[PDB]
Write a protein that binds this ligand. Sequence first.
Ligand SMILES: [Zn+2]
Length: 257
Amino acid sequence: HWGYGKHNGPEHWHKDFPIAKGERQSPVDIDTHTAKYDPSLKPLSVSYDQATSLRILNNGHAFNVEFDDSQDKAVLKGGPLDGTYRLIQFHFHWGSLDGQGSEHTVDKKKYAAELHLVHWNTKYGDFGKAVQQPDGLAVLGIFLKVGSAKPGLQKVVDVLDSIKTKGKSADFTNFDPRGLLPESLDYWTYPGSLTTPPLLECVTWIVLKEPISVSSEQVLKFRKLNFNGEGEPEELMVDNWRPAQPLKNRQIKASFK
Ligand SMILES: [Zn+2]
């Protein structure tokens, strides 16, 4: 099916998923000098106090840390968002080298990786219904640059050996997502889509200005993961990012000056 290789990568996705050349596709390049400061935006509210992590899984494209979203235990509100959005999962996109890996880019600059915290609008009852709405999802994007280690990320790094191949999953209870956030919550926001098939245009993207730092050793372990399933020829899980798409008829708003 779809992938990130030469014969099934982003350049090929539009064939089975024509929305790939749609009206509001993601990611996009954030031209910092074109974004409009919007004083009408309210403060961003990240309430991960009662977040309950359950499991970590390698789905063949990346790995997801899933959360219990049966109640409002970990939610995102405020900013450009109307209503409450529940955290359902988070995952990363990274490169084979430190100079690439992020999906969104800032003034064309590519970061080593990008963290995506996925939330869905509770007014729609469930995730499956939410992805069918223009304001169904809110994804918080955080850039990762290589430098000093991120303490809150180590617990994830250490369990990657147990989910090396496609299909594998491990228990991952009691993980605190708050440990992955940078100091500042300043951000850029625009209407977009999922960055992987089915590329549904149901996302309000919230991209933080301040990146977090991870160590060379930490990212190296991400690159040891496999796209393939157990007992198959090894394909390192690297460069699982979609390149920037045309902004088209959209405007990027900034929460800061
Ligand atoms: Zn993502």
